[PDB]
Amino acid sequence: NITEEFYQSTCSAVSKGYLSALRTGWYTSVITIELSNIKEIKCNGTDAKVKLIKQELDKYKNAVTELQLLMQSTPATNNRAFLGFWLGVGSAIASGVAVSKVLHLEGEVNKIKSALLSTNKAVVSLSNGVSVLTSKVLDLKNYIDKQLLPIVNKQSCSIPNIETVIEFQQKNNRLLEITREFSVNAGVTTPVSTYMLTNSELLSLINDMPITNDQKKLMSNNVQIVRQQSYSIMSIIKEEVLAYVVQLPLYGVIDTPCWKLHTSPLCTTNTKEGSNICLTRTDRGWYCDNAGSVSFFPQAETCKVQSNRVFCDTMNSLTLPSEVNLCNVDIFNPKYDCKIMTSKTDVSSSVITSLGAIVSCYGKTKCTASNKNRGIIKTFSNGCDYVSNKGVDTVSVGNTLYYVNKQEGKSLYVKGEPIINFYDPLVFPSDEFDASISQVNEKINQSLAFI
Amino acid sequence: NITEEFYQSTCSAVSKGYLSALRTGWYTSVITIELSNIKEIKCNGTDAKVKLIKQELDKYKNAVTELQLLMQSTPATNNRAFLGFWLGVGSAIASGVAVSKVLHLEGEVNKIKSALLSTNKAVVSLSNGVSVLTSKVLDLKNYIDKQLLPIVNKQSCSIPNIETVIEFQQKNNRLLEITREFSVNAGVTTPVSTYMLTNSELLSLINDMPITNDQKKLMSNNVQIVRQQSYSIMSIIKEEVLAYVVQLPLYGVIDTPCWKLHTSPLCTTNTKEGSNICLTRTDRGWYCDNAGSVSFFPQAETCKVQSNRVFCDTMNSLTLPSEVNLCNVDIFNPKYDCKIMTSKTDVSSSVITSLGAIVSCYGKTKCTASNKNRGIIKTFSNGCDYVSNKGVDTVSVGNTLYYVNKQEGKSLYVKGEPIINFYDPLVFPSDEFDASISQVNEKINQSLAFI
Amino acid sequence: NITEEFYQSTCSAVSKGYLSALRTGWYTSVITIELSNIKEIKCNGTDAKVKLIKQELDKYKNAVTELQLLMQSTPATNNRAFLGFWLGVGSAIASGVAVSKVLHLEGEVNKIKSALLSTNKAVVSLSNGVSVLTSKVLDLKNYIDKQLLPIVNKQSCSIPNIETVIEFQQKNNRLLEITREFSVNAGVTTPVSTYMLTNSELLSLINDMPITNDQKKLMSNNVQIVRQQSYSIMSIIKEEVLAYVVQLPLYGVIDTPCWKLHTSPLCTTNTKEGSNICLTRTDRGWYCDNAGSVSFFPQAETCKVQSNRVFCDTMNSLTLPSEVNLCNVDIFNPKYDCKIMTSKTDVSSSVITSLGAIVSCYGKTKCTASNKNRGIIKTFSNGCDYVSNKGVDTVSVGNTLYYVNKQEGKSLYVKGEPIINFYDPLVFPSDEFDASISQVNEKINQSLAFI
């Protein structure tokens, strides 16, 4: 059950009661498609049903030709060199590309083809060492050699029935689409499409993964999230086997507390126009308890939320001491230096929270919260304020209409004096772009000594 | 007719003569697909035409199974917690998700199925209250029960003709694609694809909307823009009816003046290398008059422009006093504090405007404007300059070639002394990341008192 | 062969040994599809094979109707008005849109239709002047007039065979998909899909381009990259011809040296918590020698890397003096003012380089580098450090696991004192958001004079 608290002193709000699901590692799985080496199509026929099989066979041959141009290139994701700019930089698919390099080595391909001879699903120990679960999803070699073979290799082609022309177009379409996606994605796609892996196959891949029963239940009830956080890496096409690597999210952190810290600018409301100072907490984002520290996601838009569960990637996190949470109840606590910025602003805005809305209303801006049946129900005055989503349908700031989340949950309004009122405007360090409480303090004592 | 003005004093340019089209509200509409509860397919047949119907029936059943995994999850868009970082934060699909929650309630589904029994287009008052326009686009229940029913439910299957196998694949493809998109988008897509709503159906949905005749004409002549600003929200699949919510843009603001303010860095050009100071207007973006204020879009790349009309979302806007426009003619006006930043830069760049190009040329950079038939026609000197797009095809700065817009329109070069020349470099507040004219002034008077 | 160097003094690393491929200009090519003006389909027939041809003919007519709504609108890409925010602003498709405006003029269409009457590939001089290579990829007019004509125009329709219903659906699908993409992209797509241009046609378009043999070899071995950097611009549909403009990357810069500069924060490691100062190089990104200057891409994620070649767009570059490279060996050199920022940070992070990983480890964060078979092999201490990818599989910082690139190459650890140790914390300009070595120096001398 979700709850929420607003801190009038620091113009922020925390939504509590969420559960974690943090991508920590990667499970690399091999997907294979058995092909037939169709060098040529010896058939003169002008028969309409043969003409359509030759057309679908050219697309197949062209798809193979297209895919060979891709396996000859090293696939790669290109990465860099409020607080998101402090984030580390990691190669997102370095594990999958390492496995893709193993599939290029001679004989390694033959190991895969042989393991999937009797079953379409088997575990394989690779030459380098990593144990991967291989799965054959399409046996076009078998189909062509059993249905389309008598029509090729003979100049006098035995004309096929209409249902084979249609069924071949059906089976071949998957290969053409897998090729279509790799052709515009430089051999690396994400999310993984239902052509790379159908919902049927994905679930079957999950239930056979070396993971706990908790994780199997979790990934299956959130397959749409698994796809968005997965990659499909084109690998090899040789010796009648097309292989592409699928990289699936591992959730090493599950069911730990998560909260979302919302922040908005806190300014003075003096009638004198330029005499106002401002202060804004920059530690907003998702927080989840994680191994005695707190995983901090400074760009909450990167996480994905399903009901009350939060799906994030630790690649988008900073690892903070748990004391960072003291900034919500006491931004002046002596145990963690709470981050703020102090660029002046005279613009109004609202932040829609999980169960309410923060309103930073300044200047001459109209700021209200309304109900569809009753119109305006609260009028915000200058400063930073909050309203609960109970009985409220919309919030308007200026010419911007916000809808509030109608999620069920109790909100708590923690009254407090705006901390912006404690500072003398004559010695306030404005335009600190990425500072903190202590940094402002020690800059104030330096400007006071100079005076 | 488009015009433009360049202010040599503040290194900026304003393109005038545009018309607004601002997304203010949302029109939620229900799209439905009548299905048949096909529990099983009792048929032993090895006939090729029956084998292909069983194959297409499995895809249908799997699509339903896939969609049920999605209706069991709460759909959500994940949002945050030059001046874009001052923007509010709103749930983009909170209205559609509220309607999606109403469709989950018992009996509410039966209301929809009954209203669309005789017509495929009807208005429905929901239990909560909002009046929504429901539209049935596919009756697969009717098709299967009228063409595919005699082949199932009988162990001795009456074999169907080839044209029914093909036509069933045709009709069923739309359902498989709608499912395909929701499966990789966590049940929320945007833009709305032609599978969610065909151009035929969208226009028919627009002409029946409760909106003015002006808005009907507007949305129809810009359907490609309507799609990009729309969402499709998976809702429910129960009682033989699949329902997904489509959220369409409401344009409460139309035909008001719009102008695009372009800005580029203004620096001194002293021969002494480190003695130079810089100044850059940070109020660039789209501006549109809106209800006595001015809607300001600080990230112009979010708006979409079609001929001389500007399509923006008020969710991406700040609401400023109209006096903000005084910064173009007089950046020192006493009625609005014009925003600037003062980080030093020695790099050159160009901004391609609607009818010309601004050039910030500094250091040893080659800056020219050429014509395809005649080569270089103007050579920029150090400082901030401008050239009109008449007779000019390209602008080069350093190793970067810019093409200019060949749009027709008159440009006006407003000569003026660069305001960067009015400041003493010895007491200039460099590296003000988000300041303003007054903030620089009062920081200069503080550094002068200390001296 | 790739190499790399880490500078312990400035907490940065440079990967050397790459080759350039810089998009400088645009090659505009015209793609055409010959259509038939099918006003109406005079046929009463209830025959199943005729019903399916009427269905596929409606989709064709609707696709034309949809495309006419798009040619009536001016296509446009919407653009703006660490160091990426200093980048110029250019219209990405201004050249293609200029050609699209030429196709709208009367008689210009007839010139194209006539040039492609005998061949499906010919060069055309346009009325304005630019020489463009036109290519007809689909002749649906010929197909309908030769196979589907006897079934229309007659009330007593000669019923067609089943293979023509299927083949018409096959040929028509490309048109429906081209229309599908333009309908959700406001008539401008990128990357160019295989429906806009198949891998077969693209290569054929490349080999016939007016470019050097080096460039033909380059673009063909990297077709997946060409597509991602290409645009497809809907143009005209009139006089039985649909024309859309394809804009292809021109690589004026090839085979010049490229290096990727990685940077991470450099801080003091005093036991006193708030007494620490920090410094971070902001010149990270891709660098490539380019015409005696250096093209600098401050957002390395925009470039695309294939093996050891770097594909970038000069539109995403700044043109710097080559002396900028002196910041790697001597950040204090007197010939270029090296850019830094000095916002304090106490968070740890790692940057995965081409051949190793930088680790900025501060506070109480666990920072290690492990091997899959042997576990932790190095433990980082507070400060900024580096480890080579030889023998190392992963790096962990806090709760974040990074995989290292297993690329082959030698790394060089250039020992040096952290330059952050040279500054007195009592007069250090913290929170300089975009400064440089000289700017910090001259601000230190001003704070010292005040003291």
Cross-chain Cβ contact B81/A224 below 8 Å: no
The DSSP code for C146 is I
In this structure, the answer to whether residues A67 and A195 fall within a common structural domain is yes
The DSSP code for C347 is -
Domains identified in chain A, total number: 2
**Nearest CB to A183: which of C199, C262, C372?**
C199
CB A34 within 8 A of CB A237: no
Domain end position, chosen among A209, A235, A253: A253
* C-alpha span between B152 and B159 (Å, rounded): 10
Q: Which residues contact A119 (CB under 8 A, 6 or more apart)?
A: none
What phi and psi values does residue A162 have, to the nearest 5 degrees?
-75, -30
ω before C265 within 30° of 0 (cis)?
no
Provide the 3-class DSSP secondary structure of residue C382: coil
- C211 alpha-carbon distance from chain centroid: 21
The sign one gets for the Cα dihedral A20, A24, A28, A31 is positive
b/e map A362-373, b = 16+ CB within 10 Å: bbebbbbbbeee
Q: Which residues contact B271 (CB under 8 A, 6 or more apart)?
A: none
* C-alpha span between C300 and B111 (Å, rounded): 55
In this structure, the answer to whether residues B279 and B313 fall within a common structural domain is yes
* C-alpha span between A394 and B65 (Å, rounded): 35
Those of residues 246-275 in A touching chain C at CB distance below 8 A are 253
Please give the single-letter amino acid code of residue A25.
Answer: G
* C-alpha span between C128 and C95 (Å, rounded): 13
Which structural technique was applied?
X-ray
Please give the single-letter amino acid code of residue A26.
Answer: W
How many Cα atoms within 13 Å fall on the side-chain side of residue C208? 17
CB B178 within 8 A of CB B196: yes
* C-alpha span between C51 and C45 (Å, rounded): 7
Closest CA–CA distance from residue A224 to any residue of chain B (Å): 5
In this structure, the answer to whether residues C275 and C150 fall within a common structural domain is no
CB B331 within 8 A of CB B437: yes
Please give the single-letter amino acid code of residue B223.
Answer: V
Name the token pair of B289. Answer: 């008059």
* C-alpha span between C16 and C6 (Å, rounded): 11
b/e map C236-246, b = 16+ CB within 10 Å: bbeeebbbbbb
Name the token pair of A109. Answer: 């391909």
Burial class (CB in 10 A: 0-12, 13-18, 19+), A146: exposed
* C-alpha span between B362 and B358 (Å, rounded): 13
The span from the first CA to the last CA of chain B, in angstroms, equals 53
H/E segment holding residue C220: helix C213-220
CB B450 within 8 A of CB C448: no
* C-alpha span between B143 and B146 (Å, rounded): 5
The DSSP code for A276 is -
Tell how strand B12-34 and strand B3-7 pair up.
antiparallel
Cα distances (Å, whole numbers) of residue B90 to A110, A353, B267 = 54, 8, 38
Name the token pair of C118. Answer: 């005998």
Give the DSSP per-residue string, A10-45. TTEEEEEEEEEEEEEEEEEEEEEEE-----------
Burial class (CB in 10 A: 0-12, 13-18, 19+), A250: middle
In this structure, the answer to whether residues C12 and C115 fall within a common structural domain is no
Name the token pair of A220. Answer: 């299956």
b/e map A411-436, b = 16+ CB within 10 Å: bbbbeeebbbeebeeeebbbbbbbbb
Burial class (CB in 10 A: 0-12, 13-18, 19+), B320: buried
* C-alpha span between C96 and C28 (Å, rounded): 6
Q: Which domain holds residue B431?
A: 3-20+257-450
Nearest to A155 by CA among A61, A232, A45: A45
Nearest to A276 by CA among A183, A383, A171: A383
Cross-chain Cβ contact A301/B98 below 8 Å: no
* C-alpha span between C227 and C196 (Å, rounded): 10
Burial class (CB in 10 A: 0-12, 13-18, 19+), A216: middle
Q: How many CB atoms lie within 10 A of CB B417?
A: 9
Provide the 3-class DSSP secondary structure of residue C238: strand
Nearest to B406 by CA among B427, B391, B424, B426: B391
Domain end position, chosen among A236, A253, A270: A253
CB C33 within 8 A of CB C136: yes
Cα distances (Å, whole numbers) of residue A400 to A112, B248, B291, B320, B339 = 58, 17, 11, 12, 22
Those of residues 172-201 in C touching chain B at CB distance below 8 A are 180, 182-187
What number of H helices and E strands is found in chain A?
10, 24
Cross-chain Cβ contact A430/B436 below 8 Å: no
Those of residues 390-449 in C touching chain A at CB distance below 8 A are 397-406, 430-431, 433
Q: What is the 3-state secondary structure (H, E, C) of chain B?
A: CCEEEEECCCCEEEEEEEEEEEEEEEEEEEEEEECCCCCCCCCCCCCHHHHHHHHHHHHHHHHHHHHHHHHCCCCCCCCCCCHHHHCCECCCCHHHHHHHHHHCCCCHHHHHHHHCCCCCEEEEECCCCCEEEEEEEEEHHHHHHHHHCCCCCCCCCCCCCHHHHHHHHHHHHHHHHHHHHHHCCCCEECCCCCCCCCHHHHHHHHHCCCCCHHHHHHHHCCHHHHHHCCEEEEEEEECCEEEEEEEEEEEEEEEEEEEEEEECCEECCCCCCCCCCEEEECCCEEEEEECCEEEEECCHHHCEEECCEEEEEHHHCEEEEHHHHHHHHCCCCCCCCCEEECCCCCCCEEEECCCEEEEEECCCCCEEEEECCCEEEEECCCEEEEEECCCCCEEEECCEEEECCCCCCEEEEECCCCHHHHCCHHHCCCCCCCEEHHHHHHHHHHHHHHC
Tokens 């790099």 locate to B347
H/E segment holding residue A166: helix A162-183
DSSP bridge pairs for A280? A341
Q: Residue A227: list chain B partners with CB under 8 A.
A: 183-184
Tell how strand B318-321 and strand A375-379 pair up.
unpaired
* C-alpha span between B387 and B375 (Å, rounded): 15
What phi and psi values does residue A429 have, to the nearest 5 degrees?
-75, 85
CB C433 within 8 A of CB C344: no
Tokens 């309304």 locate to A370
Q: How many CB atoms lie within 10 A of CB B153?
A: 12
Torsion angle of the four alpha carbons C314, C317, C319, C324, in this order, in degrees rounded to the nearest 10: -130
The DSSP code for A213 is H
Burial class (CB in 10 A: 0-12, 13-18, 19+), A391: exposed
Closest CA–CA distance from residue C308 to any residue of chain A (Å): 9
What phi and psi values does residue B80 have, to the nearest 5 degrees?
-75, 180
DSSP bridge pairs for A370? A376, A394
Q: What is the Cα gyration radius of chain C? A: 30
Torsion angle of the four alpha carbons B376, B381, B382, B387, in this order, in degrees rounded to the nearest 10: -70
* C-alpha span between B175 and B170 (Å, rounded): 10
CB B311 within 8 A of CB B229: yes
Provide the 3-class DSSP secondary structure of residue C68: helix
Cα distances (Å, whole numbers) of residue B250 to A401, B20, B215, B311, B314 = 12, 13, 9, 11, 11
Q: What is the Cα gyration radius of chain B? A: 30
Cross-chain Cβ contact C398/A318 below 8 Å: yes
In this structure, the answer to whether residues B230 and B294 fall within a common structural domain is no
Domain end position, chosen among C205, C223, C253: C253
Burial class (CB in 10 A: 0-12, 13-18, 19+), B3: middle
* C-alpha span between A337 and A436 (Å, rounded): 6
Among A183, A253, A333, A335, most C C-beta atoms within 10 A, so best to mutate, is A183
> This structure's resolution (angstroms)?
2.9
Name the token pair of A344. Answer: 């002046």
The DSSP code for A146 is I
* C-alpha span between C45 and C57 (Å, rounded): 14
* C-alpha span between A225 and A223 (Å, rounded): 5
Name the token pair of B177. Answer: 């694609």
Q: Which residues contact B172 (CB under 8 A, 6 or more apart)?
A: B56, B59, B60, B140
Name the token pair of C265. Answer: 């924060």
The span from the first CA to the last CA of chain A, in angstroms, equals 53
What phi and psi values does residue C399 have, to the nearest 5 degrees?
-95, 20
CB B388 within 8 A of CB B357: no
Name the token pair of A247. Answer: 């990289």
In this structure, the answer to whether residues A240 and A271 fall within a common structural domain is no
Nearest to B103 by CA among B250, B249, B234: B234
* C-alpha span between A373 and A375 (Å, rounded): 6
In this structure, the answer to whether residues A56 and A181 fall within a common structural domain is yes
ω before B191 within 30° of 0 (cis)?
yes
Among A373, A397, A399, most B C-beta atoms within 10 A, so best to mutate, is A399
Name the token pair of B365. Answer: 């950079």
* C-alpha span between A120 and B347 (Å, rounded): 59
Torsion angle of the four alpha carbons A141, A147, A150, A156, in this order, in degrees rounded to the nearest 10: -120
* C-alpha span between C372 and A23 (Å, rounded): 19
Q: What is the 3-state secondary structure (H, E, C) of C147-211?
A: HHCCCCCCCCCCCCCHHHHHHHHHHHHHHHHHHHHHHCCCCEECCCCCCCCCHHHHHHHHHCCCC
* C-alpha span between C198 and C186 (Å, rounded): 22
**Nearest CB to C191: which of A65, A184, A450?**
A184
In this structure, the answer to whether residues C179 and C90 fall within a common structural domain is yes
* C-alpha span between A80 and A89 (Å, rounded): 7
* C-alpha span between B266 and C356 (Å, rounded): 40
Nearest to C255 by CA among C214, C285, C210: C214
Give the DSSP per-residue string, A285-354. EEEEEETTEEEEES-GGGSEEETTEEEEEGGG-EEEEGGGGHHHH-TT-SSS--EEE-------EEEE-S
In this structure, the answer to whether residues C289 and C197 fall within a common structural domain is no
Q: What angle do CA A394, B316, A380 make, to 5 degrees?
A: 40
Name the token pair of B108. Answer: 């509410």
Please give the single-letter amino acid code of residue A429.
Answer: P
The DSSP code for C59 is H
ω before A191 within 30° of 0 (cis)?
yes
Give the DSSP per-residue string, A108-142. HHHHHHHHTTT-SEEEEE-SSS-EEEEEEEEEHHH
In this structure, the answer to whether residues B133 and B199 fall within a common structural domain is yes
**Nearest CB to B55: which of A164, A170, A304?**
A170
Nearest to A222 by CA among A248, A189, A246, A260: A248
The sign one gets for the Cα dihedral B320, B325, B326, B328 is positive
DSSP bridge pairs for A236? A243
On whether any CB of chain B is under 8 Å from the CB of C80, the answer is yes
Provide the 3-class DSSP secondary structure of residue C52: helix
H/E segment holding residue A242: strand A241-263
Provide the 3-class DSSP secondary structure of residue A182: helix
For helices C48-71 and B162-183, the axis angle rounded to 10 degrees is 40
In this structure, the answer to whether residues C272 and C220 fall within a common structural domain is no
CB A165 within 8 A of CB A49: yes
The span from the first CA to the last CA of chain C, in angstroms, equals 53
In this structure, the answer to whether residues C317 and C293 fall within a common structural domain is yes
Nearest to B229 by CA among B245, B210, B248, B214: B248
The DSSP code for C219 is H
Cross-chain Cβ contact C352/A91 below 8 Å: yes
Tell how strand B367-371 and strand C231-238 pair up.
unpaired
For helices C213-220 and C199-207, the axis angle rounded to 10 degrees is 170
Closest CA–CA distance from residue A92 to any residue of chain C (Å): 8
CB C172 within 8 A of CB C59: yes
* C-alpha span between C202 and C197 (Å, rounded): 6
Q: What is the 3-state secondary structure (H, E, C) of A359-384?
A: EEECCCCCEEEEECCCEEEEECCCEE
Cα distances (Å, whole numbers) of residue B208 to A396, B122, B192, B216 = 28, 10, 18, 9
Q: Which residues contact B252 (CB under 8 A, 6 or more apart)?
A: B22, B24, B25
Please give the single-letter amino acid code of residue C403.
Answer: Y
On whether any CB of chain C is under 8 Å from the CB of B327, the answer is no
What phi and psi values does residue A449 have, to the nearest 5 degrees?
-65, -35
Q: Which residues contact A292 (CB under 8 A, 6 or more apart)?
A: A322
**Nearest CB to C166: which of A52, A81, A94?**
A52
Name the token pair of C353. Answer: 């380089």
Cross-chain Cβ contact C404/A91 below 8 Å: yes
